[PDB]
Design an enzyme around this catalytic site. Structure first.
Site, PDB file in Angstrom:
ATOM      1  CG  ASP A 103       4.373 -32.197 -14.163  1.00  0.00           C
ATOM      2  OD1 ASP A 103       4.547 -33.349 -14.608  1.00  0.00           O
ATOM      3  OD2 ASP A 103       5.017 -31.739 -13.189  1.00  0.00           O
TER       4      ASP A 103
ATOM      5  CB  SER B 293       5.916 -50.914 -20.326  1.00  0.00           C
ATOM      6  OG  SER B 293       6.268 -51.366 -21.620  1.00  0.00           O
TER       7      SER B 293
END
Ligand SMILES: NCC(=O)c1ccc(Br)cc1
Length: 330
Positions: free
Chosen positions: A35, A199
């Protein structure tokens, strides 16, 4: 040193991935959920409330000659889906794909929430975010990666998640056979303890690329792709019959649909998520309504590049003094 371990989806939907982890002496092998969005290594154990164990493999520290109780240490964690677990802490030898860390904090669950109990395939989590998020008190503990770092050939690990197929976590090296083209690296902020990056924008199907900064985290521990409502609306608008359902808890679409791809920007590079990756199947058994793999991050407080996004790429988690993230197509 290096390590290399295969990671396997837990079901037909890639809801999560499990990776075998050797704990203790002799080895006790548990299948953990790696994770990158949390920083605790915790396991189902001999200490876990018996009624909260249903099929999981447990760690039994009393059977490990190298296990040592970390006196006074406790842990307690709550995840973004509302799940939780807590317990006490041992140190022990932990190995992942041939890479061994001694004195790793292994957090033994005394309590787990229903969602963990109900998932017989996940024996625990191995956190790979930054150790600043680790919940052990009163002495915060380091992640497996942080402990391994100095010994690694290169201070990196890579996530290569499969679509409906096994994939690989590597530690300490970049497998140049595992991706196509070049790896594009992008800056990381560790300020929130996550692999947080920005992004450069997105495209829906064959549509034009929208240049827009989207700050989010690379999180292998989250199934779906969670993005701003504007983005997600623009995606599902291209799917006839798709709608946001409050009763279901997100965008659903007719199972008869062919989904468009979704592209996200990494600097000047582009990662394309095939439409099939965004299909998470009937909302309930036999339903013709299917659950979308791209959902709004509104109300979460952060955008999450979960498995839906990450499995479309070869992803480098660069833990150098200034961390970065790298993305390649594959
Ligand atoms: N990041 C949270 C996470 O990895 C997670 C995995 C399995 C269950 Br059940 C609940 C949460």
């Amino acid at each position: 040193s290096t390590g290399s371990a295969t990671t396997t989806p837990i079901d037909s939907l890639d809801d999560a991935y499990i990776t075998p982890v050797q704990i203790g002496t002799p080895a006790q092998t548990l299948n953990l959920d790696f994770d990158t969005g949390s920083s605790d290594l915790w396991v189902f154990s001999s200490e876990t409330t018996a009624s909260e164990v249903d099929g999981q493999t447990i760690y039994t520290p009393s059977k490990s000659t190298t296990a040592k109780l970390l006196s006074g240490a406790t842990w307690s964690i709550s995840y973004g889906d509302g799940s939780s677990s807590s317990g006490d802490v041992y140190t022990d030898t932990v190995s992942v794909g041939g890479l061994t860390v001694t004195g790793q904090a292994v957090e033994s669950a005394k309590k787990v929430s229903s969602s963990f109990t109900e998932d017989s395939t996940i024996d625990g989590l191995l956190g790979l975010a930054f150790s600043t998020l680790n919940t052990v008190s009163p002495t915060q503990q380091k992640t497996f990666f942080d402990n391994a770092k100095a010994s690694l050939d290169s201070p990196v690990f890579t996530a290569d998640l499969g679509y409906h197929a096994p994939g690989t976590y590597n530690f300490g090296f970049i497998d140049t056979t595992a991706y196509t083209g070049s790896i594009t690296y992008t800056a990381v902020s560790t300020k929130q303890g996550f692999w947080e990056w920005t992004s450069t924008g997105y495209a829906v199907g064959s549509g034009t690329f929208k240049s827009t900064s989207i700050d989010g985290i690379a999180d292998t521990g989250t199934t779906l792709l969670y993005l701003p409502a504007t983005v997600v609306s623009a995606y599902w608008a291209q799917v006839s019959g798709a709608k946001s359902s409050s009763s279901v808890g997100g965008y659903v679409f007719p199972c008869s649909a062919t989904l468009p791809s979704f592209t996200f920007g990494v600097g000047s590079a582009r990662i394309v998520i095939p439409g099939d990756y965004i299909d998470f199947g009937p909302i309930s058994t036999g339903s013709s309504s299917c659950f979308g793999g791209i959902q709004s991050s509104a109300g979460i407080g952060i955008n999450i590049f979960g498995d839906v996004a990450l499995k479309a790429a070869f992803v480098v988690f660069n833990g150098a003094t200034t961390p970065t993230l790298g993305f390649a197509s594959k």
